[PDB]
């Protein structure tokens, strides 16, 4: 079994209490919810600094804790749940975004079994990159693996160099790539456990260089299991547009 950890993400600059928008007489972050429960969770949790947001969230049935207003990273988020909520330093946790209501319920479940299969302190997914444009964007983090998908690096520059087609290249929106490059996504698995030790690790010059927080486990020599997602899953709401795109989905999915 495991349990999933979902951060309300109340704060937003062009869609501020995103939580709460309505799609479909459901509050976005209910949505999150229900589709963690799909992925065969034993427990899911929702975790926010918002008052409004926790009464919501109560009134549809979800456990949720309280995380305090300071400025310490999602990560150190994750940490204090686990802590107020005494959670066994060997349960799984899987931390979904309060903004994905399209999440696909199996590639919840495929990092929550990669992370028991491998017995690794950390798993993630990937997909992959089939666009020059998105692979040279910093925006989308690459990321690397061995032959048994134990992450060699991520990062926003493009990796693995294709030597032929870099070289002296002139327009990079018009190179043809191989099939190697791949996108990480954000979804994790981790031992409740290891969340303590991971906050605690010092700061690297790594990731405050390529402001990646998942290098300081590489950096601090942890192993990190990576695969490819089953489903690719939607980008995040965060503008009207975004919201206005799901609406329209789940309006056409029930008719």
């Not at 589709?35 to 979800?62: C, M, P, Y």
């Not at 290249?169 to 698995?189: C, E, F, M, N, T």
């Amino acid at each position: 079994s495991f349990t999933v950890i979902i951060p309300a993400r109340f704060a937003s600059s062009r869609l501020p209490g995103k939580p709460l928008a309505d799609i479909k007489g459901k509050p976005m972050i209910q949505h999150v919810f229900e589709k963690a429960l799909q992925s065969g969770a034993s427990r899911v949790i929702i975790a926010t600094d918002n008052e409004n947001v926790a009464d919501v969230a109560k009134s549809f049935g979800a456990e949720v804790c309280m995380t305090s207003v300071n400025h310490n990273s999602g990560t150190e988020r994750l940490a204090e749940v686990v802590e107020k909520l005494a959670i066994p330093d060997n349960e799984i946790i899987v931390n979904i975004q309060g903004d994905e209501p399209l999440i696909p319920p199996v590639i919840v479940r495929q990092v929550a079994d990669n992370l028991a299969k491998f017995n690794v302190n950390m798993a993630s997914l990937a997909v992959k990159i089939h666009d020059a444009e998105e692979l040279f964007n910093p925006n989308a983090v690459k990321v690397l693996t061995d032959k048994d998908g134990y992450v060699l690096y991520f990062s926003r520059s493009v990796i693995p160099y294709d030597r032929d087609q870099f070289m002296n290249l002139q327009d990079v929106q018009k190179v043809q790539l191989s099939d190697a490059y791949l996108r990480h996504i954000g979804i994790y698995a981790y031992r409740a456990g290891f969340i303590k030790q991971y906050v605690q690790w010092a700061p690297t010059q790594l990731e405050n260089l390529e402001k990646l927080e998942q290098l300081r486990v590489l950096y601090n020599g942890e192993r990190i299991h990576v695969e490819l997602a089953k489903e690719v899953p939607a980008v995040g709401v965060d503008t009207a547009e975004d919201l206005e795109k799901v609406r329209a989905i789940l309006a056409a999915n029930g008719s």
